[PDB]
Design a protein around this nucleic acid. Structure first.
Ligand SMILES: [K+]
Ligand SMILES: [Mg+2]
Ligand SMILES: [Zn+2]
Lengths: 175, 133, 47, 59, 118, 76
RNA sequence: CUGGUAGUUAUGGCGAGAAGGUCACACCCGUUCCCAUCCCGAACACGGUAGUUAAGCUUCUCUGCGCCAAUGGUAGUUGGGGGCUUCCCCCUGCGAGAGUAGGUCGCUGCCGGG
RNA sequence: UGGGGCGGUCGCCUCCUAAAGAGUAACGGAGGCGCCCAAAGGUUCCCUCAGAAUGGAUGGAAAUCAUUCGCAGAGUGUAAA
RNA sequence: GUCAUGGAGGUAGAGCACUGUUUGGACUAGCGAAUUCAGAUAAACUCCGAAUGCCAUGUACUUA
């Protein structure tokens, strides 16, 4: 809503000026956001899995998806078929809402804020942030948490080069 | 020289018709031994020839062996009759057709090269000649 | 696996033979098969 | 948009306890509070710590 | 992020459909194209590679345009009438890789109501 | 001394059963195979164990579809 | 000129460089409705057209890769005849694979609109 | 049955030998079978694998997530073709 | 039987595109796995591929 309106009003001219694109369609835009939990301790107690399910369903507000192994690993006492993680995807305006909440009341509310490592881009134009402690969530209280399961927050855009992705990401608050 | 592993432990003996398919030119060194006839060459013969020709040069220059003993052969002991399956493997052999270069050397003058190749050719069961690139 | 006979529930005719696994299917199998006597499809049950 | 199945989240207003910073965004919990800001509509209120406005790194 | 081409995957599905359905002289196939605005229908046999009838949501007359669906029904009506005029009575429907759900389904049903026999 | 080998299976008599350009009657077997080494063409069917058979009367033609494959047809 | 839909062993493909247009096509905007997501109107489905050729798409130019490919020679070989038989030689007919000269940035058909 | 004995073998399937149709022997060279599946069968609709590079908490070369490359380097109940 | 025409089929030869075996450099994750350069090898390897033999068609010529 507000973030989308601000972006479409300002960043589009700002980006079309800062890089001189032939057409406005070349402007890199956010596409989707993926929140992945990752749970490698499911073969002893399965309550960890559905646990991760409810805190995902609260922090995001929609049912996650149970993901299972694509092969078997003897070392990790696995065979094919273990539900071994959960994930959520976000698109559109709700994506913008999550982005705003993270940049205002979640990232600033972290234990420390020493910026965001500008070299963590994949080399194509997408970004990944790794949350270690689950208690940093605004709406989730740690008293009902069993473990600090980190979240991969994957931010994908239509930026051909990492430079434009950095422009867009730093333009919207947290660098 | 023995292969590390093989897919099969027994193999047909084959034949040696025709001129060598490839390897009939000196490609790494300046001098080479060329086969004039066809023959099975075992790994004992290769080792003996190599030691002779390397000792004559006093570990100077470079030597390339252009044949490998890929094939195995079997045998039966004294006192056993015919039949009851194939025998047990004994050694490893390379079938060498006429025209094949089987040893190359470099890094030494004419005299040393030719005398080393002459010393080596007397350890081999095949009729040879010395060629220069 | 074991051998099985399927009996028509309206005639008692034993029309079909098949197989099953007794550990996976401990019950009596029921299938809807053609009955040659009545010339129509009828439910068949394991004997 | 799962018809009925999806969990219920509502637009809620966050209030900072340091500089009285006011923001509006979706939230899975309404915190059982009421406000009359953002003329034309009403959103529930939530009390939290310093937001990015009062962040040491953002200032 | 590469954007998927709708027409490429649609043609892949269309080839899968065409694995079974092929139009002959006695039983030509009725092929349907659906764009973002209009709807198109052809009646064609594959033995000679020639189409025998056609209709579109672009002709000068029949301007009833209400939500692209009754337009599809009108197009089906037109193509059925023309095919009957040419003597075509039995056809095999080619959905063209599209689902049998909306505008395509309406076109097919409207053609069924008239002188066509699916 | 023992061999520990010595087993084999009976030969199954595969390959072409009719010639190119030959007149054939309906139901005749044209080719026997494992897998579709040759594909069915016009008026030719594929059996349950990959056998190719004629469905009508006509003349047999072995033909080449796209570069790497083959088929067989029967034309009246 | 363009949209749809076929045939043809990639000489038709991959790659690179540019032009073009809401007449068609597409991206795009939205989710009331039919329908949909192991979650997501992303796709599928439906309802419209503010912006656009940025991409798909169409048109033109490149041999870089890929693909196609002679002629001569050689290997092999049916038949006839000889050696000094791990094999080799001669006469007649057939005749590769590799390598190369060279070719290629497609060619044909039907329909609806400009 | 390269005398007989001892040892081994005796039915079926797949490859090589087998000489570019089919067939073809030896106490020749290699392996499987004496089952399984109520879906791992029928049909309708949909879609695509192994591996690698890069970026990220527990997590480590390899577990889950994201992008790119990727004609099959995977899979096909089980031996091989 | 020969001639003309059309087919199925992977041997000889050859090759390294897959699978095994293998030599010398450059470079190398760390004496040494991968990548590349050059050069080898195969009954149970094949991106290729004959001569012959085989199956048909003919109204061709001869012959039983
Ligand atoms: K000698
Ligand atoms: Mg199956
Ligand atoms: Zn009955």
């Amino acid at each position: 809503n507000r973030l989308k309106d601000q972006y479409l009003k300002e960043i589009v001219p700002a980006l079309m000026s800062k890089f001189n694109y032939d057409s406005v369609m070349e402007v890199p835009k956010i596409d989707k956001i993926v929140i992945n939990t990752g749970v490698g301790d499911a073969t002893a107690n399965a309550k960890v899995l559905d646990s991760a399910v409810e805190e995902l369903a609260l922090i995001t507000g929609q049912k996650p998806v149970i993901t299972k192994a694509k092969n078997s690993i003897a070392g990790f006492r696995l065979r094919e078929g273990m539900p071994i993680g959960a994930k959520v995807t976000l698109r559109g305006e709700r994506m913008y809402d999550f982005l705003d909440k993270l940049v205002t009341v979640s990232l600033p509310r972290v234990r420390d804020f020493r910026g965001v490592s500008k070299k963590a881009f994949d080399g194509r134009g997408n970004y990944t942030l790794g949350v270690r402690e689950q208690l940093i969530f605004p709406e989730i209280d740690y008293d009902q948490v069993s473990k600090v399961r980190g979240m991969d927050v994957v931010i994908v855009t239509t930026a051909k080069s990492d430079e434009e992705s950095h422009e867009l990401l730093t333009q919207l608050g947290m660098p | 020289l023995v292969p590390k592993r093989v897919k099969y432990r027994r193999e047909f003996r084959g034949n040696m018709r025709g001129r060598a398919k490839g390897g009939t030119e000196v490609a790494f060194g300046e001098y080479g031994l060329q086969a004039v006839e066809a023959s099975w060459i075992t790994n004992r013969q290769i080792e003996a020839a190599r030691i002779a020709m390397t000792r004559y040069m006093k570990r100077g220059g470079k030597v390339w062996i252009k044949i490998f003993p890929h094939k195995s052969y079997t045998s039966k002991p004294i006192g056993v009759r015919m039949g009851k399956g194939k025998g047990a493997p004994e050694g490893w052999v390379s079938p060498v057709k006429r025209g094949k270069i089987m040893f190359e050397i470099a890094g030494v003058p004419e005299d040393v090269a030719r005398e080393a190749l002459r010393l080596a050719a007397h350890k081999l069961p095949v009729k040879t000649k010395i060629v220069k690139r | 696996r074991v051998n099985i006979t399927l009996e028509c529930t309206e005639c008692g005719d034993r029309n079909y033979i098949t197989t099953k696994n007794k550990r996976e299917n401990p019950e009596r199998i029921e299938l809807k098969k053609y009955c040659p006597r009545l010339r129509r499809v009828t439910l068949h049950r394991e004997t | 948009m799962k018809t009925g199945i999806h969990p219920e989240y509502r637009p809620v207003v966050f209030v900072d306890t340091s500089t009285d910073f006011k923001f509006l965004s979706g939230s899975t919990k309404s915190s059982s509070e009421t406000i009359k800001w953002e003329d034309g509509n009403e959103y529930p209120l939530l009390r939290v710590e310093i937001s990015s406005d009062s962040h040491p790194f953002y200032t | 992020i590469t954007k998927i081409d709708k027409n490429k995957v649609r043609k892949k599905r269309h080839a899968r459909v065409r694995s079974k359905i092929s139009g002959t002289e006695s039983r030509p196939r009725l092929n349907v194209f659906r764009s973002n605005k209009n709807i198109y229908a052809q009646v064609i046999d594959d033995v000679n590679g020639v189409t025998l009838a056609s209709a579109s949501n672009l002709d000068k007359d029949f301007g009833s345009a209400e939500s692209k669906v009754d337009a599809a029904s009108k197009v089906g009506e037109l193509v059925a009438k023309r095919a009957s005029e040419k003597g075509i009575t039995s056809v095999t429907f080619d959905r063209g890789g599209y689902l049998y759900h909306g505008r395509v389904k309406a076109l097919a049903e409207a053609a069924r109501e008239n002188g066509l026999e699916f | 001394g023992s061999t520990s080998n010595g087993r084999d299976s009976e030969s199954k008599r595969l390959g072409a059963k009719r010639a190119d350009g030959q007149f054939v009657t309906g139901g005749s077997i044209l080719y026997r195979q494992r897998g579709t080494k040759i594909y069915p063409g016009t008026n030719v069917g594929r059996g349950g164990d990959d056998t190719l058979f004629a469905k009508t009367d006509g003349v047999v033609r072995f033909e080449r579809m796209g570069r790497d494959k083959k088929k067989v047809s029967v034309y009246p």
